[PDB]
Amino acid sequence: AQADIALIGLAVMGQNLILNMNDHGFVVCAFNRTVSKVDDFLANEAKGTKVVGAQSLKEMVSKLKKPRRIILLVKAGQAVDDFIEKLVPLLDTGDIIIDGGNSEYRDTTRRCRDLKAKGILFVGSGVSGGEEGARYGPSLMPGGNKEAWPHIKTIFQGIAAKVGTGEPCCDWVGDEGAGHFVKMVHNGIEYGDMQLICEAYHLMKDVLGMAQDEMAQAFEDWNKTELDSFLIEITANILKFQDTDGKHLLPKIRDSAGQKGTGKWTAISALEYGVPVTLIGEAVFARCLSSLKDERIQASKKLKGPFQFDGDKKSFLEDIRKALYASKIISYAQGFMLLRQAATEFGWTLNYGGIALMWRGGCIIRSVFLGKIKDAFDRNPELQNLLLDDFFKSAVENCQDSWRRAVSTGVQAGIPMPCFTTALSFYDGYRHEMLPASLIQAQRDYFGAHTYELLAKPGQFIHTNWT
Structure with missing residues (x-):
């Protein structure tokens, strides 16, 4: 186990995040569902770097220092769940999956809860900055299972854009789908x-x-x-x-x-x-x-x-x-x-x-x-x-x-x-x-007996016989 972290999904965003992590001294294991893309990346954009490759998920997992940290940067939706499903049997309690894709927050909440119940720590992180940002300094918005935060903070804050006073544009956002x-x-x-x-x-x-x-x-x-x-x-x-x-x-x-x-x-x-x-x-x-x-x-x-x-x-x-x-x-x-x-x-x-x-x-x-x-x-x-x-x-x-x-x-x-x-x-x-919304309440009580409240007695519902 020599790699600090893995990233799955070698489109430009993923490649750039990998190179960013590499710049900051981290050893990254690259993986892609079409595995030939791994060799291509190593031979080209990542030539001369500390990046290592894997030819299968099992191999990728084996190269990772525990607790294992795996970033997913794949197409939002089923591709994320499918990689999660393949990863779970390969991982140990306390290992960490980070979805950095443009995922819908309710999916992130679901995954966070379901993985927590299985002993896997899940982070859903927003990523902003486009390709250039990914390469040199993205804004990162991680949320999910906070047990993961102490284990990813160094890498995530390290690669994040900094403001002029030095603070990283990345901190723990909050629970479950909050980052997304x-x-x-x-x-x-x-x-x-x-x-x-x-x-x-x-x-x-x-x-x-x-x-x-x-x-x-x-x-x-x-x-x-x-x-x-x-x-x-x-x-x-x-x-x-x-x-x-x-x-x-x-x-x-x-x-x-x-x-x-x-x-x-x-x-x-x-x-x-x-x-x-x-x-x-x-x-x-x-x-x-x-x-x-x-x-x-x-x-x-x-x-x-x-x-x-x-x-x-x-x-x-x-x-x-x-x-x-x-x-x-x-x-x-x-x-x-x-x-x-x-x-x-x-x-x-x-x-x-x-x-x-x-x-x-x-x-x-x-x-x-x-x-x-x-x-x-x-x-x-x-x-x-x-x-x-x-x-x-x-x-x-x-x-x-x-x-x-x-x-x-x-x-x-x-x-x-x-x-x-x-x-x-x-x-x-x-x-x-005071706003005229009281008139809406009166109208609905008039035409439908829906009731209103008096200012003096909130929470008590009154019907008036207006006619």
Whole structure:
């Protein structure tokens, strides 16, 4: 037994993770169901390294130091269960299987429980960063059976992306499917951040009449303060990019972002668990709307909008920045509410601060803002809503006049802002002690005798004879 860890699945992600582990001084045993791929890898991408191969699962297992650690990086679904089924008879009590694929969190929960009962420790880990990230520094989001954590922490944190202060973008997320649940929410959050940037762009372009390079410079400027983030960095770069003919490329690109994307699962989860994750929902629906390109061409010939901007451009541009920032705060508050609800549903203990850190590093959504979320949970690990943290409370308070102006102006101009508006609507709802939902309760009691509760006596159900 000379190998520190094994990885099954030699597509590019797996190869790159193996090479990353190798760089960090670990001896990795590579395996693939089509075994010829092992030799190919050893002869090529892994030539000259400490990587060793195996020609069967039994051989692979035999090469591993106990407790044995085996990473699965294969196609999500049946391929994962099939490898688990083949591995179990070969392993000893206390050995560890880590699924790093894009698996559905309920499958991860099932596997964790079933393997625990058989004496096998199971980890389901989110992996973010794509192929480059895998190779040099992914974000890793491990959850499952925490008995495994002390045995995988050194390798996982070693290979993970680090932030500038040195902390690894990898820590124990929580129980069972929590790691994969967190990856799912991350995917939805990404949709939100992208849509928010798009709305800011649309306001710059169509309310302020800004030039492409001017908008690039605005995003570059924005990237120097609170909004500092990878998505804003690349947006600036995209905006100034010129095609071979000297014309800007972005205006030539088809505005259809797809109807079937994975972000939908975050919004579906929110609806399943009854959490008001409104911004990610609008971001998903905005991609769907964009996909109706021919329908929008037709509608644009038949349906009319309202306007001419008269004001200080620099000021309104700043209003857009602050609207974006406040809306982003609401989106993440909502995402963390969903995490909190899953914790409640399944009895999971979630590393909220660590999750914020894990979403930096290799993740597309990486930002300084995420460090502020970590700070909030470090200040109060019992924090119940991001909006209650003094930093975020202050930020929203300082942004809200600008936010309202940006939204009011966009509305008068006919610019669609499904995410800015849902975020503001949510903020205004969340902060109200009294909402008109009592009218819904009265309506249902009126038409169906479904009963309502009095404010003074919650939990007691009353029917009134309204007629």
